[PDB]
């Protein structure tokens, strides 16, 4: 119909999705209403300006933002001076999603830099001369794999990497994030991710790990940082993804998990929140929505017959609408929500989440959903590692030619 | 001695007491990537931090230098590790360090390193006497600070300080009955003290929750809690619940009440109840109402549920193909 609005967020009924505070105001409802009011302005900005809505992913702008940041950053990134491999990864993956080539001049300079970040004892630090830590180790390995050259692969000292992982392993199955550091589910995922890609997983490396992770699932259905803590999309992604790598997804109550994550998508905004009763945020477009492709593969592995063969169990269209209309900075780069400033972290995950929502794939079945102009389509991303599905295969294949350290 | 923001602050390369030390520039290589254009103050402090670290100089001056390095980037875990090495080698007073961490967390409460540092201090001193109060102050500024709640659970658990936490929980739920962190803390306290098997306790909790649900029918936290404490034993195990929820259908409806009803029907059809068909249709009716009207954002989930229920509870579900 002519009166029919193709955009879910602009349809008249959408107005019914606004928050109902039952005339009972608390800090939570107040903050939630503030955001919805701002998001509503964005949605109805076309109507008020008397223009036809058009959703365009500002590729050119994001490329420039990323291209430059990969080489140089302002002092605004001083707070990430101990997360430089993360910067390499967030940027390289964003370029990958946008399907932009990585010049060998860059690739080789990245390799050399990460080489300098690598510790003599194994693992990568947040910068040259910094002690090794599982977060930058995870980022570094992912970055080198995105590059996927023999040179990038050879940067990783597999013997020491394994030694390092062992030095962090705890009796209860968990891992420290670094020597004398904290413990939470992120480490299990970081360890599983780099160990599986570089083929260094030994018979006992992850003993008790699946059980420990399973203890982090709480009454909410989601997973918390450590046993007993509130469920959160960041830790839930880490927990499930790690269990998938270890092939122990079944250790969890997948049903309560599925119900929890699907409930994390905001009815009005369209994006996801990190935990119940908090605010929507673009990076969860990946941490939360990225869980659905994982649950689909887990349930289908269990022969679940009711599994759709075209879509993920979340409103794909609404998520894309949220990201495209509310999370792009006009000067390039993406963000948390309107009013927040861009950064490479949100640029990486908003894009990763957009990709997930655009591409459905359960084996031979393949169905895409690209909101707005067709140029908006990005390259696919692997739901476990969050790097190109091809980079994963290529990387694992390459390292499977090597022998698991110590044989 | 000299604060990082002090008007008379001086770069380390201009300090007499540091003349013997040659700073160590960051080794970024010939052609750097993600190179940060640090400010003078930043590069100066870190060039000197790199020097003391490299020499493993365990001195009072190195100790003070870590404070500035941390202030410039509290996320630099390498600096925190060296600082803890200095705390022990120099035999620094740990209560003084506690006063220090208290202040740093107050200004940068969403950082991982500061909370881990505080935990290490408490562990060393074996003294949790200041924790609940300190955390309470942080939670007073951000009632949902994840690290704060995690530290609180750790402290309570490790030193068995369960006695007043439920009271603290009630207080915060009163301030904001929508605070999911507090509903989580409630489940934390109870399951570790009495447990939810004690019928008197479970009874109390459900009444409390339903009572909060009446006051704020659209608050998703109360619903998730109600479901969380009854789902393990099985929702169908409690016949009065289903009815009592339908009694709110008119004056307290929400996509949450509709959703719960489906969960009850679901478990009922699981534990083969009476009228295994009147319940099923009642469920598919709701699943469709949600996927098409009351909760369309989750249409792909509700259609899957409606499908799963039909795939195993229809009258044809247990009937042979040839029949």
């Amino acid at each position: 119909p002519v009166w029919s609005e193709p955009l879910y967020s602009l349809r008249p009924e959408h107005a019914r999705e606004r928050l109902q505070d039952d005339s009972v105001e608390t800090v939570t409802s107040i903050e939630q209403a503030k955001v919805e009011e701002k998001i509503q302005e964005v949605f109805s900005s076309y109507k008020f300006n008397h223009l036809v809505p058009r959703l365009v992913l500002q590729r050119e702008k994001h490329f420039h933002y990323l291209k430059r940041g990969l080489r140089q950053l302002t002092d605004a990134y001083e707070c990430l001076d101990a997360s430089r491999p993360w910067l390499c990864y967030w940027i390289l993956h964003s370029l990958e999603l946008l399907d932009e080539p990585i010049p060998q001049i860059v690739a080789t300079d990245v390799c050399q830099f990460l080489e300098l970040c690598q510790s003599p004892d194994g693992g990568f630090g947040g910068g040259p001369g910094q002690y090794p830590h599982l977060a930058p180790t995870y980022a570094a390995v992912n970055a080198l794999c995105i590059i996927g050259t023999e040179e990038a692969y050879n940067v990783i000292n597999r013997e020491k990497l394994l030694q390092y992982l062992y030095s962090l392993k705890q009796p209860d199955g968990s891992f420290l994030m670094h020597v004398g550091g904290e413990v939470d589910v992120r480490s299990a995922y970081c360890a599983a991710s780099v160990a599986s890609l570089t083929n260094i997983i030994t018979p006992d490396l992850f003993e008790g790990t699946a059980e420990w992770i399973a203890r982090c699932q709480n009454w909410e259905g989601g997973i918390g940082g450590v046993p007993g803590m509130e469920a959160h999309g960041g830790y839930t992604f880490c927990g499930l993804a790690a269990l998938v790598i270890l092939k122990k997804e079944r250790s969890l109550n997948l049903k309560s998990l599925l119900q929890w994550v699907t409930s994390r998508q905001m009815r009005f905004e369209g994006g996801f929140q990190g935990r119940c009763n908090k605010l929507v945020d673009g990076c969860y477009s990946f941490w939360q929505a990225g869980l659905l492709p994982l649950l689909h593969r887990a349930l289908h592995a269990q022969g679940d017959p009711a599994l759709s063969m075209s879509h993920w169990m979340f409103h794909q269209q609404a998520l894309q609408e949220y990201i495209l209309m509310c999370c792009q900075c006009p000067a390039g780069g993406l963000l948390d929500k309107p009013g927040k400033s861009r950064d490479f972290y949100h640029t990486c995950y908003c894009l990763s989440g957009l990709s997930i929502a655009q591409h459905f794939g359960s084996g031979a079945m393949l169905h895409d959903v690209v909101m707005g102009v067709p140029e908006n389509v990005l390259q696919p991303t692997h739901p476990v590692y969050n790097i190109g599905p091809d980079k994963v295969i290529q990387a694992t294949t390459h390292f499977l030619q090597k022998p698991v350290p110590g044989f | 001695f000299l604060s990082l923001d002090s008007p008379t602050y001086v770069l380390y390369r201009d300090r007499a007491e540091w003349a013997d030390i040659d700073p160590v520039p960051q080794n970024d290589g010939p052609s750097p990537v993600v190179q940060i254009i640090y400010s003078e103050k930043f590069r100066d402090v870190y060039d000197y931090f790199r020097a003391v670290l490299q020499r493993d100089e365990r001195s009072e001056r190195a100790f003070k230098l870590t404070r500035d390095a941390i202030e410039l980037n509290a996320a630099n875990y390498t600096v925190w590790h060296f600082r803890r090495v200095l705390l022990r080698s120099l035999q620094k007073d740990l209560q003084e360090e506690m006063n220090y961490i208290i202040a740093i967390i107050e200004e940068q409460p969403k950082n991982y390193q500061v909370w881990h540092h505080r935990r290490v201090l408490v562990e060393w001193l074996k003294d949790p006497s200041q924790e609940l109060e300190f955390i309470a102050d942080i939670l007073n500024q951000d009632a949902k600070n994840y690290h704060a709640w995690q530290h609180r659970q750790w402290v309570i658990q490790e030193f068995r300080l369960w006695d007043n936490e439920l009271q603290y929980v009630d207080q915060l739920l009163k301030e904001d009955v929508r605070n999911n962190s507090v509903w989580n803390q409630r489940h934390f306290v109870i399951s570790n003290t009495t447990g939810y098997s004690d019928r008197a306790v479970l009874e109390r909790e459900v009444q409390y929750t339903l009572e909060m649900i009446k006051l704020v029918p659209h608050n998703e936290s109360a619903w998730n809690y109600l479901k969380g404490i009854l789902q393990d034993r099985g929702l169908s195990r409690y016949p009065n619940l289903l009815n009592q929820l339908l009694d709110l259908q008119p004056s307290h409806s929400s996509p949450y009440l509709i959703a719960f009803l489906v969960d009850i029907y679901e478990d009922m059809l699981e534990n083969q109840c009476d009228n295994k068909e009147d319940i099923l249709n009642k469920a598919l009716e709701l699943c469709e109402i949600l996927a098409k009207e009351k909760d369309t954002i989750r249409k792909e989930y509700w259609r899957y549920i409606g499908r799963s229920l039909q795939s195993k509870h229809s009258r044809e579900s247990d009937i042979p193909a040839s029949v």
Binding site: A82, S83, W86, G126, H133, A135, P136, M177, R186, G234, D281, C283, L335, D336, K340, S341, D343, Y345, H346 | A75, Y77, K110, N111, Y112
Partner: peptide, 5 residues
């Protein structure tokens, strides 16, 4: 904004 490590 958000923090990972």
């Amino acid at each position: 904004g958000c923090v990972l490590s």
